[PDB]
Amino acid sequence: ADYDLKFGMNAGTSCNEYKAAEMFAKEVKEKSQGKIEISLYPSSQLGDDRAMLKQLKDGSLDFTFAESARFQLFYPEAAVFALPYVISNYNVAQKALFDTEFGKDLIKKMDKDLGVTLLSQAYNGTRQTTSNRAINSIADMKGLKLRVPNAATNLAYAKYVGASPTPMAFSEVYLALQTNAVDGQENPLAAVQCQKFYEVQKFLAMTNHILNDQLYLVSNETYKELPEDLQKVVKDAAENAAKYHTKLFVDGEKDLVTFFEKQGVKITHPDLVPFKESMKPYYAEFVKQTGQKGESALKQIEAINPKGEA
Ligand SMILES: CC(=O)N[C@H]1[C@H]([C@H](O)[C@H](O)CO)O[C@](O)(C(=O)O)C[C@@H]1O
Ligand SMILES: [Zn+2]
Ligand SMILES: [Zn+2]
């Protein structure tokens, strides 16, 4: 307890994100000879991820998770990461961030403007849609009161497929599902399982609409005060946690549909061509709203070859 550091997250203690942060935490403690202890604060105990990003910026929190897409809060063209159906697989998400001019500049702005250092990137699942009635095709989204996070790209997903979006914090979601204050939500299969949303949702549609990555972030105010050896400890441990993280989500996606079926959830596979078609005006509005910077970021993402990690 030379450094008593803290890691906040929206995920709960059953979740892949917690499990991976636990590995991060335990490895940092070991490979730092006990000089660094990391405590974990899940389930939004410190606020949502907008609050925790601000806490990293002002140095009041040491570590947290964010998606690349979340930086649309500060740079609207960064929403390109979460335009539904634009990023096809995790390979694309990795190259969008690290192997494009747009993404390399985002990392630099994250450092110089927002005070956060990007330690590592993991895969955080592809979002699906649960509901209290079957989504057999895009038609069934009409009138669906669909909970979304407080995030404009999730809002737009629900809106352009014809649903009625209802933003609310992740910690509020189980209650709203349980009482039918909303008709459904959208999250990767992992969250549907670890947050027990399947207990309170009879239907799951494979909409595959947004791919989530996950960034291991550290406050610059924290990172700068660590000796270089301990900086290296934290970076190595972040990278090792991220590979564990990704494997948890990949393996889970081979598996969880079966699990949910055992629980009595009905799985549908709606035709996704009309879903993808309905986003085309949204892409246009994005480019209209964000200008050259958004158009250029989108062209850069679109050109990435979906095949082969890097
Ligand atoms: C790093 C992080 O906190 N991810 C969280 C995301 C993002 O906030 C959202 O996708 C916008 O970026 O929202 C959830 O999926 C949600 O509330 O449904 C929970 C998840 O834990
Ligand atoms: Zn329409
Ligand atoms: Zn299937």
Phi, psi of 146 (to 5 degrees): -100, 115
Ligand nearest to the CA of 277: 2
Residue environment code for 120-139, b if the CB has 16+ CB neighbours within 10 A, otherwise e:
bbbbbbbbbbbbeeebeebe
State which approach was used to obtain the coordinates: X-ray
SS3 65: strand
Instruction: Kindly list the domain boundaries of the chain, sorted by start residue.
Output: 3-302
Integer Cα distance of 177 and 185 in angstroms: 8
With beta carbons less than 8 A apart as the criterion, state whether 187 and 208 touch: no
Look at strands 3-8 and 145-148 and give their pairing: unpaired
With beta carbons less than 8 A apart as the criterion, state whether 243 and 237 touch: no
* Residue to probe by mutation, ligand 1, list 55, 64, 67, most atoms within 8 Å of CB: 67
Ligand nearest to the CA of 159: 2
In eight-state DSSP terms, residue 197 is G
Integer Cα distance of 96 and 144 in angstroms: 32
What does CATH list as the number for 3-302? 3.40.190.170
Resolution (A): 1.9
Residues pairing with 6 in the sheet: 39
| Amino acid identity, position 234 | V
Neighbours of 4 (CB within 10 A): 10
| Residue list, ligand 1 pocket, CB within 6 Å | 10-11, 49, 65-67, 69-70, 149, 151, 170, 187, 191, 212, 214
Count CA within 13 A, CB hemisphere, residue 62: 20
With beta carbons less than 8 A apart as the criterion, state whether 113 and 185 touch: no
Residues pairing with 297 in the sheet: none
Among 108, 26, 100, 34, which Cα is nearest to 71's? 108
Integer Cα distance of 208 and 269 in angstroms: 10
In the block, which residue shows the tokens 């592809």?
A: 126
With beta carbons less than 8 A apart as the criterion, state whether 56 and 116 touch: yes
Beta strands (DSSP E) in 42-135 are 63-66, 116-131
